[PDB]
Amino acid sequence: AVVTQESALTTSPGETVTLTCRSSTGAVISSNFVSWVQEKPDHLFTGLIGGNKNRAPGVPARFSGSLIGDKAVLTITGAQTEDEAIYFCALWYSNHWVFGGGTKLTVLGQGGGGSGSQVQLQQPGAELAKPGASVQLSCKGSGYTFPNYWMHWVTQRPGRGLEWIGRIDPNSGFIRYDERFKTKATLTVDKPSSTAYMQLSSLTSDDSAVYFCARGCYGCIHFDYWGQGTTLTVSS
Numbered sequence: 001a002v003v004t005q006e007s008a009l010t011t012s013p014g015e016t017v018t019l020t021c022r023s024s025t026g027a028v029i030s031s032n033f034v035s036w037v038q039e040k041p042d043h044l045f046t047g048l049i050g051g052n053k054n055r056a057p058g059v060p061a062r063f064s065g066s067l068i069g070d071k072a073v074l075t076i077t078g079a080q081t082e083d084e085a086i087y088f089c090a091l092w093y094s095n096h097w098v099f100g101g102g103t104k105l106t107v108l109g110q111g112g113g114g115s116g117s118q119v120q121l122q123q124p125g126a127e128l129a130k131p132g133a134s135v136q137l138s139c140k141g142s143g144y145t146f147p148n149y150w151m152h153w154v155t156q157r158p159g160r161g162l163e164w165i166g167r168i169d170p171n172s173g174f175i176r177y178d179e180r181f182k183t184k185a186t187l188t189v190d191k192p193s194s195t196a197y198m199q200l201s202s203l204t205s206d207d208s209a210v211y212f213c214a215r216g217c218y219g220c221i222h223f224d225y226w227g228q229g230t231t232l233t234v235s236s
């Protein structure tokens with residue numbers, strides 16, 4: 001399954017912009033349970049929509065989402081200068097998430113207009129590791145009841161886009177891995193320290209990338225809050 005978005009769109013402050021997201025099946029359906037997330041510079045992600053149409057609490061009213069004409073659509077009614085960002089949609093395909101390629105939204109024109117965090121996920125900024133070794137990545141959640149949400153892990157590099165690695169449910173113990181990462185990643189959690197861990201084993205040069213944790217929950221706003229990302233460098 002391949003998820004397609006407009007590569008770029010240009011708007012101005014005060015205009016209404018629609019961003020679209022199509023499935024290679026020919027239709028985005030309700031069970032794809034779509035999230036929309038926004039990336040700003042220094043790979044700073046925020047979730048905007050979950051469950052196809054639910055605006056995440058705290059997200060401004062100018063954002064809305066729904067399924068229309070066999071696609072998923074995010075609408076910004078009255079774009080603001082600060083909405084310049086990369087917007088990604090994420091679709092659930094029964095046992096894995098797939099991200100679109102992202103839409104770079106440029107907002108050109110008069111700044112200064114528009115309408116104006118409990119949850120934090122803390123990740124170390126960087127890790128350096130040698131080939132053939134393993135590395136542990138950590139993600140400490142604060143400001144919510146940590147075991148009651150799942151933790152997703154996602155990776156990003158330019159050219160490859162965003163790739164979902166897997167998720168862990170602290171209260172059930174159930175873990176899902178994407179097929180691409182099933183032998184590379186191991187997910188664990190420690191409830192007393194409110195920390196989720198990802199081990200990457202048998203490191204190679206191909207593993208250098210940014211690795212994020214992001215909260216999720218069945219039927220709720222997947223990818224609502226994200227860590228800042230850990231940049232892993234595998235030495236030569």
Ligand SMILES: O=C(O)CNC(=O)Cc1ccc(O)c([N+](=O)[O-])c1
Nearest residue numbers: 031033092167176216217218219220
């Ligand atoms: O269809 C609905 O009402 C709710 N759907 C969802 O929340 C999407 C979903 C479902 C199962 C599952 O195991 C994962 N996951 O991320 O592992 C995500």
